[PDB]
UniProtKB/Swiss-Prot annotation:
CDD domains, sorted: SK
Entry function: Catalyzes the specific phosphorylation of the 3-hydroxyl group of shikimic acid using ATP as a cosubstrate.
Cofactor details (free text): Binds 1 Mg(2+) ion per subunit.
Region forming the signal peptide: none
Compartments where found: Cytoplasm
Membrane keyword on record: no
Gene: aroL
GO biological process: amino acid biosynthetic process; aromatic amino acid family biosynthetic process; chorismate biosynthetic process
Species the sequence originates in: Dickeya chrysanthemi
One Pfam family of this chain: SKI
E.C. number: 2.7.1.71
Outcome of substituting residue 147 to S: No effect on activity and substrates affinity
Protein name: Shikimate kinase 2
Binding-site residues for Mg(2+), renumbered to this chain: 16, 32
């Protein structure tokens, strides 16, 4: 089916890259909520936070989620998208959610911090699992994740 596919996970799990390659494989559109915010508002997350705080950024992020969710589209989401319950509900309702899981060690390794990702996971691991319909090993190359997702999720290639 063509419900929107939400990619969730912590910074460093490869969301944008896997999202983009999955979208290409399925013939879907691709949008990253963080990138959408930047290029529609002109403001970075630091700008938004400096002007309106973390609460203001989280509201914008919720709004972005709602604005870009549509069928036949893969949506890569920022690390903190899973913090608000309404965001978690929105994603499981509107579509199907995939958590790109990696231990903190590997998240920290990816740097195109080890203990800061450990702490991110203590706060958010359970939230990623709560919202995810499907959990995949994000330490594989993107192409291998793409392949595994199409099989597990029973999605045809474009
Ligand atoms: Mg759904
Ligand atoms: Mg789950």
């Amino acid at each position: 089916m063509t419900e929107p596919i939400f990619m969730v996970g912590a910074r460093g799990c490869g969301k944008t890259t896997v999202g983009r390659e999955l979208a290409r494989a399925l013939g879907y559109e691709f949008v990253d909520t963080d990138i959408f915010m930047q290029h529609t508002s002109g403001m970075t997350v630091a700008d938004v936070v400096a002007a309106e705080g973390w609460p203001g950024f989280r509201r914008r992020e919720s709004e972005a989620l709602q604005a870009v969710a549509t069928p036949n589209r893969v949506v890569a989401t920022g690390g903190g998208m899973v913090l608000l319950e309404q965001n978690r509900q929105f994603m499981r309702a509107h579509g199907t959610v995939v958590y790109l899981f990696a231990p903190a060690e590997e998240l920290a390794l990816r740097l195109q911090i080890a203990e800061e990702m450990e702490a991110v996971l203590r706060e958010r691991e359970a939230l990623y699992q709560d919202v995810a319909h499907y959990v995949v090993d994000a330490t594989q190359p993107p192409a291998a994740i793409v392949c595994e997702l199409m099989q597990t999720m029973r999605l045809p290639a474009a």
